Amino acid sequence: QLSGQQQRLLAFFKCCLLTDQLPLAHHLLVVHHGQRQKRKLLTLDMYNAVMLGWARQGAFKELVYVLFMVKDAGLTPDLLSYAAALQCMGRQDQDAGTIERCLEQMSQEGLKLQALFTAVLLSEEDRATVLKAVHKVKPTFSLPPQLPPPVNTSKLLRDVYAKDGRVSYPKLHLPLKTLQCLFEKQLHMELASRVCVVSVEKPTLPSKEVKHARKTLKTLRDQWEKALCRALRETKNRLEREVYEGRFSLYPFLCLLDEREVVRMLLQVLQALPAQGESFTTLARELSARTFSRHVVQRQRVSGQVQALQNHYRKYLCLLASDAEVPEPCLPRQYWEALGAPEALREQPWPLPVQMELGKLLAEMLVQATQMPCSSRLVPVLYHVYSFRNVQQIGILKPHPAYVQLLEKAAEPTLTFEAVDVPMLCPPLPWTSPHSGAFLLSPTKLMRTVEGATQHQELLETCPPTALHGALDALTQLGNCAWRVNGRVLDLVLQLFQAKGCPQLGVPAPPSEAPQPPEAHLPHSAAPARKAELRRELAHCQKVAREMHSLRAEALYRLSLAQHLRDRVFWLPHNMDFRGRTYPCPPHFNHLGSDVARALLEFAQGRPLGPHGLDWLKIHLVNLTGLKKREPLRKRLAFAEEVMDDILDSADQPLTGRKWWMGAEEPWQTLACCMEVANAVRASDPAAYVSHLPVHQDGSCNGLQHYAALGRDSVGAASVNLEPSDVPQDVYSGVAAQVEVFRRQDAQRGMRVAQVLEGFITRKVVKQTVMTVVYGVTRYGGRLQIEKRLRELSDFPQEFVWEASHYLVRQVFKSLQEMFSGTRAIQHWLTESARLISHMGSVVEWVTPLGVPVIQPYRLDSRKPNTRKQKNGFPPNFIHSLDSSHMMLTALHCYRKGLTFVSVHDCYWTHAADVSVMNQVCREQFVRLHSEPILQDLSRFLVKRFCSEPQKILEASQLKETLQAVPKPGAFDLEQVKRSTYFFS
Amino acid sequence: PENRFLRKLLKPDIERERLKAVNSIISIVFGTRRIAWAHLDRKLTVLDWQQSDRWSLMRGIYSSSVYLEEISSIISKMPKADFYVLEKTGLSIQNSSLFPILLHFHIMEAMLYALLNKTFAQDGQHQVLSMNRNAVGKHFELMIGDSRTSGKELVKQFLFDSILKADPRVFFPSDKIVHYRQMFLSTELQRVEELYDSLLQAIAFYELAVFD
Amino acid sequence: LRKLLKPDIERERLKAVNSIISIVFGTRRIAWAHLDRKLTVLDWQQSDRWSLMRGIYSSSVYLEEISSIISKMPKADFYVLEKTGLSIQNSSLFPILLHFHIMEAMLYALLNKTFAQDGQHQVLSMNRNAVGKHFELMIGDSRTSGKELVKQFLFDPRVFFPDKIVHYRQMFLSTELQRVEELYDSLLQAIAFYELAVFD
DNA sequence: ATGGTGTAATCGCCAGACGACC
RNA sequence: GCGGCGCGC
DNA sequence: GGTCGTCTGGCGAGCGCGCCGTTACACCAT
Numbered sequence A: 001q002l003s004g005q006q007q008r009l010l011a012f013f014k015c016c017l018l019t020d021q022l023p024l025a026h027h028l029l030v031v032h033h034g035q036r037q038k039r040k041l042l043t044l045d046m047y048n049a050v051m052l053g054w055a056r057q058g059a060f061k062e063l064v065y066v067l068f069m070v071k072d073a074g075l076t077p078d079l080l081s082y083a084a085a086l087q088c089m090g091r092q093d094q095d096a097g098t099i100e101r102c103l104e105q106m107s108q109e110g111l112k113l114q115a116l117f118t119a120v121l122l123s124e125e126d127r128a129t130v131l132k133a134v135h136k137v138k139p140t141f142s143l144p145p146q147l148p149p150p151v152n153t154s155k156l157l158r159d160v161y162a163k164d165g166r167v168s169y170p171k172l173h174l175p176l177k178t179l180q181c182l183f184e185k186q187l188h189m190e191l192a193s194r195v196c197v198v199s200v201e202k203p204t205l206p207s208k209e210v211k212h213a214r215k216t217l218k219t220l221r222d223q224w225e226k227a228l229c230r231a232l233r234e235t236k237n238r239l240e241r242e243v244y245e246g247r248f249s250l251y252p253f254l255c256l257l258d259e260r261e262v263v264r265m266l267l268q269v270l271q272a273l274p275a276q277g278e279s280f281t282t283l284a285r286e287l288s289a290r291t292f293s294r295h296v297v298q299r300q301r302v303s304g305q306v307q308a309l310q311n312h313y314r315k316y317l318c319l320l321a322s323d324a325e326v327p328e329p330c331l332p333r334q335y336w337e338a339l340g341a342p343e344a345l346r347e348q349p350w351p352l353p354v355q356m357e358l359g360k361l362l363a364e365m366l367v368q369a370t371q372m373p374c375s376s377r378l379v380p381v382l383y384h385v386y387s388f389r390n391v392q393q394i395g396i397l398k399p400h401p402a403y404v405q406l407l408e409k410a411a412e413p414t415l416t417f418e419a420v421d422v423p424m425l426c427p428p429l430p431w432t433s434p435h436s437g438a439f440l441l442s443p444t445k446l447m448r449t450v451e452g453a454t455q456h457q458e459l460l461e462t463c464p465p466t467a468l469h470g471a472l473d474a475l476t477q478l479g480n481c482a483w484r485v486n487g488r489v490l491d492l493v494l495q496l497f498q499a500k501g502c503p504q505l506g507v508p509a510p511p512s513e514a515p516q517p518p519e520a521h522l523p524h525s526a527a528p529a530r531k532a533e534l535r536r537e538l539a540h541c542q543k544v545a546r547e548m549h550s551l552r553a554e555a556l557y558r559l560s561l562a563q564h565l566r567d568r569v570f571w572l573p574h575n576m577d578f579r580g581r582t583y584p585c586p587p588h589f590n591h592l593g594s595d596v597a598r599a600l601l602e603f604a605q606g607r608p609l610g611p612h613g614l615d616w617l618k619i620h621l622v623n624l625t626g627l628k629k630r631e632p633l634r635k636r637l638a639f640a641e642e643v644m645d646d647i648l649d650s651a652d653q654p655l656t657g658r659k660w661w662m663g664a665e666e667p668w669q670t671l672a673c674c675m676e677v678a679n680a681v682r683a684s685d686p687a688a689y690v691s692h693l694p695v696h697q698d699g700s701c702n703g704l705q706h707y708a709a710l711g712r713d714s715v716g717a718a719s720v721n722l723e724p725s726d727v728p729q730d731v732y733s734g735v736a737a738q739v740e741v742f743r744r745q746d747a748q749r750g751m752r753v754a755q756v757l758e759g760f761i762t763r764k765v766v767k768q769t770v771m772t773v774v775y776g777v778t779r780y781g782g783r784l785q786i787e788k789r790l791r792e793l794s795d796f797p798q799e800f801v802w803e804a805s806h807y808l809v810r811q812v813f814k815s816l817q818e819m820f821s822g823t824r825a826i827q828h829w830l831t832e833s834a835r836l837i838s839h840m841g842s843v844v845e846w847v848t849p850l851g852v853p854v855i856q857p858y859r860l861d862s863r864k865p866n867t868r869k870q871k872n873g874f875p876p877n878f879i880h881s882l883d884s885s886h887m888m889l890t891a892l893h894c895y896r897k898g899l900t901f902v903s904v905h906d907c908y909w910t911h912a913a914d915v916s917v918m919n920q921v922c923r924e925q926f927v928r929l930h931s932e933p934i935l936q937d938l939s940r941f942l943v944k945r946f947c948s949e950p951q952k953i954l955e956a957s958q959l960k961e962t963l964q965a966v967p968k969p970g971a972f973d974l975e976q977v978k979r980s981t982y983f984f985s
Numbered sequence B: 001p002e003n004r005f006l007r008k009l010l011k012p013d014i015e016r017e018r019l020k021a022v023n024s025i026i027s028i029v030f031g032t033r034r035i036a037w038a039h040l041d042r043k044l045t046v047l048d049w050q051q052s053d054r055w056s057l058m059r060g061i062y063s064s065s066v067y068l069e070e071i072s073s074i075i076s077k078m079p080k081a082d083f084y085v086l087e088k089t090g091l092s093i094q095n096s097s098l099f100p101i102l103l104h105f106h107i108m109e110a111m112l113y114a115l116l117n118k119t120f121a122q123d124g125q126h127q128v129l130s131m132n133r134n135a136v137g138k139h140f141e142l143m144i145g146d147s148r149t150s151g152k153e154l155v156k157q158f159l160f161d162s163i164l165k166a167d168p169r170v171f172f173p174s175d176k177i178v179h180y181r182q183m184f185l186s187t188e189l190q191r192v193e194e195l196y197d198s199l200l201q202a203i204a205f206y207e208l209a210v211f212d
Numbered sequence C: 001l002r003k004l005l006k007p008d009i010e011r012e013r014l015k016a017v018n019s020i021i022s023i024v025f026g027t028r029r030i031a032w033a034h035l036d037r038k039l040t041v042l043d044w045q046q047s048d049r050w051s052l053m054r055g056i057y058s059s060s061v062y063l064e065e066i067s068s069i070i071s072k073m074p075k076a077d078f079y080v081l082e083k084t085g086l087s088i089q090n091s092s093l094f095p096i097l098l099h100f101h102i103m104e105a106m107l108y109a110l111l112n113k114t115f116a117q118d119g120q121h122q123v124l125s126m127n128r129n130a131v132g133k134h135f136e137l138m139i140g141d142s143r144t145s146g147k148e149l150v151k152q153f154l155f156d157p158r159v160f161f162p163d164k165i166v167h168y169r170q171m172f173l174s175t176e177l178q179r180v181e182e183l184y185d186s187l188l189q190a191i192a193f194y195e196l197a198v199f200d
Numbered sequence D: 001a002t003g004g005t006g007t008a009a010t011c012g013c014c015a016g017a018c019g020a021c022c
Numbered sequence E: 001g002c003g004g005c006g007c008g009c
Numbered sequence F: 001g002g003t004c005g006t007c008t009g010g011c012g013a014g015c016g017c018g019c020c021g022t023t024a025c026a027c028c029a030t
Ligand SMILES: Nc1ncnc2c1ncn2[C@@H]1O[C@H](COP(=O)(O)CP(=O)(O)OP(=O)(O)O)[C@@H](O)[C@H]1O
Pocket: A629, A700, A771, E009
């Protein structure tokens, strides 16, 4: 019903409202109202927009003229039009008789004053002005009172929101004024989107040539800035002259930002352009997205939202501050909502043709407005080149090679980050909505989605309000954790990085250390084999050099950000994926990363070790070493005691000693643990030592653990440590042993396949296949996993391994079928249900037991569902919802006991003094999650959702036959997990 | 040495007597999605200059019947001329990732050498020739590094400059100049490279080989 | 016959055919065979002088070679080209596969002498593996040689070789150790086309 | 250091379309 | 958005 | 056009993060 040009005109009028250019929009409106063929494009929304602009301005005569134009058009006035009229009457006071007559005329149409006051997108100021007008006319009218916020009454979430229970909520270690100045720093950092960070690469001494190159760059950039300003001014003049005649143009969109900001953004885009260029459409899209983002950020400082946010943040900081006390302690989101609530608004994006036209106009301005001397008349820097990219021909903006040469010479030691990819300098805002949230000024999204995927954020906005309060609060709590840089680890990492790095530990090497092709003495034409091997060696050396360069670039970015964040306290905000799993917003430096990233990060707040802190630190160290993975905790502690000399030597002399920590699986975290233990053991009181180190408790395999819990399998639970035992039970060792038992039976047939493989059965062969059963691995992928491991080892045949691989896949699958039977029954039921739902023509949708709705996005190219992806993704996706539910429950019940809890999926991290309490919360909520019927609730929800259509009654019955056959439960009680010492360990 | 330059410029060997005595040519530049052509007289006048943009080609399969039908439809609109100039790309068999384009460029040319070269069975003399794009770019100073750049500005100077100036390169007839300017102004947001390369190749052929 | 014949064609026009040319091309040689409705071979020939696949692709040289080859061929109502069945994903087959398409493309343009006016296709392509499955020369997923089949055919036979059959026998005995398969494949392709398409 | 240049060769199961009939 | 790699669960 | 037995091409472990680059190589020339 909406044409493209209609969207262009509506966006034009909205942008004129935002830029305060009402006479120009009025001129375009009247010139389109003059011609009769143009009036078919005009819509009541445009008239309401111009009316709202005139009402905000305060011009009554033009408003009456717009009413006359609407009456001449013949459209019916809308309630928002009457709201704008009342706003104009309020702003410009007049006799009450005319306003009363307007209200009477509105009442004759059947409109309701309550419908005018609420459910309208008008701001609070407009509502106040309309209320003043009504109070002038009728003082008896008043708004209904605001109800108290609802409390979630879910069975699993009852203890979190119970007022009668005793609570000890944690508090930060920083005073109020420090938090206020950190808020000021974060606001000033987010106002200017770019952030400049000093590189960690070893600098080069400044010669005369590099100084000359830098001076030429500075002079060229000054001329380019002035030329861009003149070009933008003349473009604005000609576009305004175009709008004066009856034609649409992009003048308000160019008036959206200040001239200097646009020139600075264009210069940044020119600087960021690579040597080999990028596609013109990509640059247009980035320019449009950047100018929209800058408009969104910079509008708030003009509208005055920044000062209101400042005052409300200052009031809200008393809850987190150590020296401030609230009257009644409560959760951060409830305290934020209890005070004045800054009304964050969902922003409507512009139409795609407008965005593309603006981007192309700005890119053309950049191309035409920049010139340089060749070094001699002036020549442009950027050119259009038609080149092949991917498998298609495309246009590319390519810079002049002189520009690239001057950029390569005198390399700038600075790097540019966005304000959203750096950690927050102030505590994040609480999560109060799917759109409002962590960042102060930048727009936010709760669920990470691909471009064009709006179903995830539309299903999240139609749920009952209480349903997400379990998740959002957890997402707030994970955001409230305060991080810091370790410092001592960073010095060693930088020392290895700036010199020739060690790739064994995880520090990439410089391109100088990359290998080179061997020297050639024989002619290439002498033998085809010689030139062929030289070409292959060169093509391998180039590839490994490119890989090394990419790895070094990633390490450089991460270490530069870490160096920027040194000696400062920062917060990592969190969001979710489409299934409920939590990820940090900053991508580069976070705790969901490699060894180096996890070893640089420490807790800002510290807690005393207590009676049992040092033992947990030692067990964590032994866990990180990996030498004792199949041993009980007491023997782990004994091993920690007997190896204390190596720990002390590694802590004192990390790089000039016996270097024991390098032998561990995670050397950097091991070194951090050795340092932390060394300080604690050498303290006067070991209990009184304050530790910032995170201690990690993990589970073996949440897929098989949760499948066993759903099926209550007696023999599966023993394998996955859901039944108490003194010694931990490994799934991989058991399946390997069963496979070795099957090979002994083969003596009957005496097959050659069996006897070559008899010696080489190992845990390593089956580990990958057993950890990937959860993701629905097929026999072919299991073969592609086993065959590689057979290839590295020196098996007796070394050929026809294809025959050996198939038998091993069959026997590992039979062993995993006898070990796990209810598990495969549930996976088969889920796969069949997903297939039958996808064949009917819908995507699988389910509600997480904490109330989060999840919809599976896979579709074909109003599209049709992808039956294969929807069928093969449901059993892996369902388990991940269960894991996130248990993690969020553990977080929400650990917060009530004053615990610092952070999660890297399947792994729960807390202070060394607070591990044992967390373990109880880890187990008591596993029994409470699985005490409630998960499978039958899922079956009933799926029946109600996907079998309510009157059409296709036969297919509905066929679907209901499968959906109402849940696998029968077993005979292992779920209340004995609470006595299992190795459930999470 | 001059013959060496013409051998580097032109793929099929053509004697100078026939090149010097031409009367009218058609320059053709094709791409994945579009083809363009221009017809020029000995006294350089653009009698027609046309674009085709809607194709079923380069969508999945490589079926030669569809190629034959589309090429016949394009050639049916083309008038007759002495020589038909075609663009030669720098793609080689070494670049495997760009092979699907190259296959396309080798099919159409194979048909354009076959369908356009009428009376080759009787006469035995070539009438379709291929010209390198890099040489044309070097002639028009459109080469930056090893990448040839667009020539939209040069064509705009050719078309919208109504002043006589001194020795114009190309003459546009007064009857067809309005439609030419309309076609130029219509395709400004979406750049159609072949429409420019056809005219540039026509001028380059009429200067480097003819009127040398 | 969508799966057997690549271009769409009416069955009524398929039934009323007099004689067909069957053409098979390789890297080094071209072979063809002229065979009529009565399953009697009128012509069977291959050429040795090729002058292509020398590392430099040139459409003018291809045009000259195909013109010289076509000038020898007699007129018929249908020209049956083979389909090689290679895939575009295999990189190592790139230098050969391109050649086939080029040789296919001109063979559609040069042989459709009236396509500009009527708009009807006189040249068709038929799938190779269907022919192999019909003649049971398919072992696994690869077709075997057809020297035994053509020796059995020529030495109620399917093919009725004519006065001129002695020359065909002399050609068959002429250096049969040379790696010539196109000459056999053209004849068996023509026989398969006459069996599957116009018969029954 | 930079920068231009003249050259090519072995599984095995599932979901959507094909031909005859209507 | 298409190729080569690396990381976490 | 609608449908059924089949068969034939195709994809074969789920999420989420990154870097880098879009005919290549010895010669030439300097
Ligand atoms: N749940 C999971 N799903 C998929 N891949 C996983 C995974 N957990 C770990 N991996 C991957 O598998 C690799 C090896 O796992 P490991 O490092 O051996 C820990 P593990 O799987 O618990 O074996 P373990 O029990 O001997 O410690 C990891 O580096 C990671 O890339």
